Amino acid sequence: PSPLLVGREFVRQYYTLLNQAPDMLHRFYGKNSSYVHGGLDSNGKPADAVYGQKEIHRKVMSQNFTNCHTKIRHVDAHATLNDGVVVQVMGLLSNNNQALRRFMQTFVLAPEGSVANKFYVHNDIFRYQDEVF
């Protein structure tokens, strides 16, 4: 369909879900899916992505998302390879009523193949600006 509308509706869904049920966030992904939600090493360098629904789940729960409140200030979305949709997102996130922090995020939504209008998140790249800059 319309890449703009697909990406706008996915972002709403993602951040609704991150708030209401983060234990089910992992359902957006598949076996090849890449995920990072910021963080950094013992060397102070940004944390590596993990892959697949199972590892993505173990990682979402280590973030201990509770009352995750998000303000989205930019969303764009565009047709990419194979009628996929790339989504750029900037906004602010507070988890557990902690600091309001700025983030830069990219998504790639890929058609699942089975039905019109069914996608999965092939890539989810989130970074907080305070960890990188």
Binding site: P1, F10, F28, K54, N117
Partner: peptide, 9 residues
């Protein structure tokens, strides 16, 4: 419309 959700694993 628009489904984004997949089966568990």
């Amino acid at each position: 419309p628009y489904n984004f959700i997949q089966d568990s694993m």
